[PDB]
Design a protein around this ligand. Structure first.
Ligand SMILES: *[C@@H]1O[C@H](CO)[C@@H](O[C@@H]2O[C@H](CO)[C@@H](O[C@@H]3O[C@H](CO[C@H]4O[C@H](CO)[C@@H](O)[C@H](O[C@H]5O[C@H](CO)[C@@H](O)[C@H](O)[C@@H]5O)[C@@H]4O)[C@@H](O)[C@H](O[C@H]4O[C@H](CO)[C@@H](O)[C@H](O)[C@@H]4O[C@H]4O[C@H](CO)[C@@H](O)[C@H](O)[C@@H]4O)[C@@H]3O)[C@H](O)[C@H]2NC(C)=O)[C@H](O)[C@H]1NC(C)=O
Ligand SMILES: *[C@@H]1O[C@H](CO)[C@@H](O[C@@H]2O[C@H](CO)[C@@H](O)[C@H](O)[C@H]2NC(C)=O)[C@H](O)[C@H]1NC(C)=O
Ligand SMILES: *[C@@H]1O[C@H](CO)[C@@H](O[C@@H]2O[C@H](CO)[C@@H](O)[C@H](O)[C@H]2NC(C)=O)[C@H](O)[C@H]1NC(C)=O
Ligand SMILES: *[C@@H]1O[C@H](CO)[C@@H](O)[C@H](O)[C@H]1NC(C)=O
Ligand SMILES: *[C@@H]1O[C@H](CO)[C@@H](O)[C@H](O)[C@H]1NC(C)=O
Ligand SMILES: *[C@@H]1O[C@H](CO)[C@@H](O)[C@H](O)[C@H]1NC(C)=O
Ligand SMILES: *[C@@H]1O[C@H](CO)[C@@H](O)[C@H](O)[C@H]1NC(C)=O
Ligand SMILES: *[C@@H]1O[C@H](CO)[C@@H](O)[C@H](O)[C@H]1NC(C)=O
Ligand SMILES: *[C@@H]1O[C@H](CO)[C@@H](O)[C@H](O)[C@H]1NC(C)=O
Ligand SMILES: *[C@@H]1O[C@H](CO)[C@@H](O)[C@H](O)[C@H]1NC(C)=O
Ligand SMILES: *[C@@H]1O[C@H](CO)[C@@H](O)[C@H](O)[C@H]1NC(C)=O
Lengths: 271, 97, 133, 95, 121, 133
């Protein structure tokens, strides 16, 4: 009644080594409905959007899951946007968009369970530089910003996990957040784990061994997910993520499904 | 304003609980509002507190609403107050060893 | 086909109700507005679930339109866009000056205005069209 | 003296939730695993999309309470379960 | 667009009122039987549009209930009109009126047709 | 096809008759009318079934786009319908007996087609101003 028996089952399907390239899937609205795009560009997600168009289907959204990053997404148009439900709460995932894609090359070279992601330095230092510009808007442009690593938890959210080609990479983004902002390339030591935690429901999954050849990955980082830690100050932004809803609250932030009611009544002086 | 007593070292199971049975997002913070332990979808996460290596939770109980917090190696300095924030029910449980 | 005009109504939102009814007259004329590849036997039953799924939309856009104009045709007028009928306007339905309605309000305001009374007018439009017959 | 009118062709909105149907340009032959899933449960893309800019309208959105984000979350659970079939699952049952 | 509009119509006063209220591989199994459920709907649209031209010739287009200026004859099943709505199903009408429905449809032609010339003068 | 595709072609009977003779047929024609191989049994059910339902819903939405256009003018379902627009006498200047006794619709429509956009604007406006006041 308190320590109730939970039978951790184990269903075993027939598992080949299948390809995996996510295509853009855009959601249309049925007949008699519409979708209201928010064509603003300072739009922080909430509040009154002053320029609203009406479209039936949205842009080709790519279902690209990851933790701690948002690969192959869609970009901003003016500056780096910083969205949150309630900022100054220290329990809400601060989303971040990029108006320029920090390209990341990631390959398994020729150990089978080892890979490397290469990201270009100073395209990252300026993009960490753009973020500490708009971050100081919600603060007192002081209280020295210190990026740092994660804190712990599962291995899926303390490292930038993704899945390119069919294998489930786990990259140690620890050089990407090590600076502190007062008032050539980088290499990341990825693995390929076979025993992962599913993001779908609660449970573990063990997969086939990695494929034999080379595994390329050309993804364009268009987004972060940070998190603060309110002490009693420097406001350290320890990155995270992992609820997969937040990967699609950053490509469905400018949309709204309404219902069209085309019958109105009014008083007139007719006869 | 619950009361939980430990001796030293033992595992205490503080508990907040919702009424949904559908694995909704919670957290766990302390009196200085630093994150102790958190849920992120279907994965666990810690926070940069001083219980970051010692805290834990039971993963299988999230699917029935029960979101515990299991602490190992009880020192004297964790005698504080802890706050579970499920969606609004910011319940406070205090701890002593 | 018809689902194109179901969304073209929204081009007059944000304007005033005197202007949007006039735009509707122009919109009245504006509401008057192919898989032939070599298909393998694997493509045959896959391009046909792409055929039925689009044709479950074109008939829903027809069947919604006839479920509109069945409800209008109860209230006297079938096929009329601008239709006024023989029910007197009650004063308790958010009383306001008629210049304070057709000149300084958008149509979305009336959703916020009389939605507490919108069901009551609909029964009156049935009864007076039944009492007159 | 004023009589009740009825207009058909009015731009009226109404906050409500519904089931959005997917659309993407799948190929219907490729054995890449998304082009398989986007053929059983999608439709071809919009060939001539309809888009109207609305004048003078203001509109309050909300990102953290959208009801189509939980409709994207459903169709990606439903993707990966028919896409990456694993060798060994371990799903807690908890009777 | 109704072809059924059933709602289990039994008692006529409940049938009249609710009428105003209500009607106001494995891919071969589902593609053959999806076209069959589109031939149901698309016919049930074209059965409506054929019908609403017939009521339009009588003058009763669009209105579900319509009243018109043709009284009963003597040989049109003269029962009392108060018990007729009390205990009878709508099914029991087409049993009760057999060959009169063809001349009722003819008289409702000329009742509108003489009226179109009457208001013309 | 097998629905309201025969109605659009059945209108074209009695061309070349006089305009009184077509009018007598208007209300009466719309009263009277509106292999042992498993592989062929599949296509006759699946892709030849869709392609004949893409032509039956084409004839529906061709028809409703006509009865909607008569709805702006005010008729919407009456086959014979006359309005409040007065006939301008600079429209072919012809005798009313010379028109309805000895002239065919094709001969008639060739006379009038210079300005049938101008007539179609008046019937919309007159039904915009008979429901305005
Ligand atoms: C963000 O979006 C981008 C898209 O823009 C994503 O980038 C994609 O990443 C995936 C994952 O790696 C790529 O898929 C794989 O690409 C490999 C590289 O192929 C390219 O180079 C070779 C050599 O020059 C060419 O032959 C290829 O041409 C192929 O692609 C074209 C279309 O572009 C087809 O039309 C052709 O017919 C060719 O097939 C490419 O130009 C490629 O090796 C790989 O194919 C193998 O891998 C899968 C499993 O991973 C097998 O199912 C498949 O059959 C192949 O397997 C053989 O080879 C491997 C060796 O790797 C052996 O081990 C096997 O046993 C077997 O022999 C697959 O095509 C994709 O190309 C790429 N998209 C691009 C570049 O546009 C990012 O991933 C995305 N980000 C995230 C996070 O998802
Ligand atoms: C956003 O989060 C802050 C906490 O960081 C909330 O502020 C708290 O509000 C409660 C109200 O019951 C007060 O008792 C606390 O003292 C506040 N704390 C701080 C640090 O301000 C704030 O209410 C949240 N925003 C919303 C809209 O709920
Ligand atoms: C990810 O890389 C970092 C960078 O090395 C690892 O952090 C520590 O880095 C110091 C370098 O000053 C090493 O001496 C330590 O051995 C590293 N590890 C620890 C535990 O302190 C970090 O550990 C790497 N992540 C993982 C999961 O191994
Ligand atoms: C979002 O913008 C609105 C006004 O546009 C403002 O009231 C709100 O505080 C903003 N929220 C964040 C997290 O920036
Ligand atoms: C990489 O970023 C560019 C924009 O600079 C974009 O056009 C391209 O599509 C991206 N590549 C992807 C998403 O694979
Ligand atoms: C990754 O970076 C290292 C060091 O900068 C370099 O030696 C290696 O060739 C790079 N690999 C790729 C695929 O860019
Ligand atoms: C990033 O660039 C700034 C100048 O824009 C420089 O001051 C800083 O040192 C750079 N970061 C690192 C880690 O060198
Ligand atoms: C980087 O992260 C690892 C574990 O994620 C941790 O051991 C290390 O101390 C971190 N580095 C910093 C500077 O926080
Ligand atoms: C069936 O008969 C019972 C008894 O008269 C009645 O209460 C019920 O409403 C009838 N069913 C319907 C659908 O009218
Ligand atoms: C053909 O022309 C003659 C002479 O004008 C006319 O009487 C006759 O009615 C026409 N044919 C038909 C079928 O109307
Ligand atoms: C009628 O239109 C034709 C072209 O269709 C033109 O040649 C002729 O001049 C026009 N007549 C009048 C009177 O407008």
């Amino acid at each position: 009644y308190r320590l109730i028996n939970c039978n951790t089952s184990a269903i075993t399907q027939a598992c080949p080594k299948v390809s995996f390239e996510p295509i853009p899937i855009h959601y249309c609205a049925p007949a008699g409905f519409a979708i209201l795009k928010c064509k603003d560009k300072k739009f922080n997600g909430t509040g009154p959007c002053p320029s609203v168009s009406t479209v039936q289907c949205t842009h080709g959204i790519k279902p690209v899951v990851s933790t701690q990053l948002l690969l192959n997404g869609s970009l901003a148009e003016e500056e780096v946007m910083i969205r949150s439900e309630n900022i100054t709460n220290n329990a809400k995932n601060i989303l971040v968009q990029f108006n320029t894609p920090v390209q990341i090359n990631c390959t398994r070279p020729n150990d089978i369970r080892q890979a490397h992601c290469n990201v270009s330095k100073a395209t990252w230092n300026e993009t960490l530089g753009k973020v500490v510009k708009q971050l100081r808007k919600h603060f007192g442009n002081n209280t020295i910003i210190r990026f740092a690593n994660s804190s712990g938890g599962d291995l899926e959210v303390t490292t930038h996990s993704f899945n390119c080609g069919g294998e489930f990479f786990y990259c140690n983004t620890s050089g990407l957040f090590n600076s502190t902002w007062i008032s050539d390339s980088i290499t990341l030591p990825c693995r390929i784990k076979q025993i992962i935690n599913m993001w779908q429901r609660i449970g573990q999954a063990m997969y086939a061994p990695p494929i034999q050849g080379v595994i390329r990955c050309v993804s364009n980082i268009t987004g972060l997910i940070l998190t603060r830690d309110g002490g009693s100050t420097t406001e350290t932004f320890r990155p995270g993520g992992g609820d997969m809803r937040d990967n699609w609250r950053s490509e469905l932030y400018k949309y709204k499904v309404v219902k069209i009611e085309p019958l109105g009544v009014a008083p007139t002086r007719c006869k | 304003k619950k009361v939980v007593l430990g001796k030293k070292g033992d595992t205490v199971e503080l508990t907040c609980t919702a009424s949904q049975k559908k694995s909704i997002q919670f957290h766990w913070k302390n009196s200085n509002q630093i994150k102790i332990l958190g849920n992120q979808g279907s994965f666990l996460t810690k926070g940069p507190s001083k219980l970051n290596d010692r805290a834990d939770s039971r993963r299988s109980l999230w699917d029935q609403g029960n979101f515990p917090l299991i602490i190992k190696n009880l020192k004297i300095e964790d005698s504080d107050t802890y706050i579970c924030e499920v969606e609004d029910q910011k319940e406070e449980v205090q701890l002593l060893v | 086909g018809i689902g194109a005009v179901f969304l073209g109504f929204l081009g007059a939102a944000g304007s005033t109700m005197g202007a949007a009814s006039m735009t509707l007259t122009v919109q009245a004329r504006n509401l008057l507005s192919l898989l032939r590849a070599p298909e393998a036997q694997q493509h045959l039953l896959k391009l046909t679930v792409w055929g039925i799924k689009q044709l479950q939309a074109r008939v829903l856009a027809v069947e919604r339109y006839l479920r509109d104009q069945q409800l209008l045709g109860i209230w006297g007028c079938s096929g009329k866009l601008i239709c006024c009928t023989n029910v007197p306007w009650n004063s308790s339905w958010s009383n306001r000056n008629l210049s304070e309605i057709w000149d300084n309000m958008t149509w979305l305001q009336w959703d916020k205005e009389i939605s507490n009374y919108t069901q009551i007018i609909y029964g009156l439009l049935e009864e007076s069209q039944n009492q007159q017959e | 003296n004023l009589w009740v009118t009825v207009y058909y062709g009015v731009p009226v909105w109404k906050d409500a939730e519904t089931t959005l149907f997917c659309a993407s340009d799948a190929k219907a032959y490729e054995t890449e695993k998304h082009n398989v899933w986007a053929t059983h449960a999608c439709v071809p893309t919009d060939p001539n999309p309809q888009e109207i800019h609305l004048e003078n309208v203001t509109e309050e959105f909300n990102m953290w309470k959208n009801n189509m984000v939980e409709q994207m979350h459903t169709d990606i659970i439903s993707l990966w379960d028919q896409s990456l079939k694993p060798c060994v699952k371990l799903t807690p049952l908890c009777v």
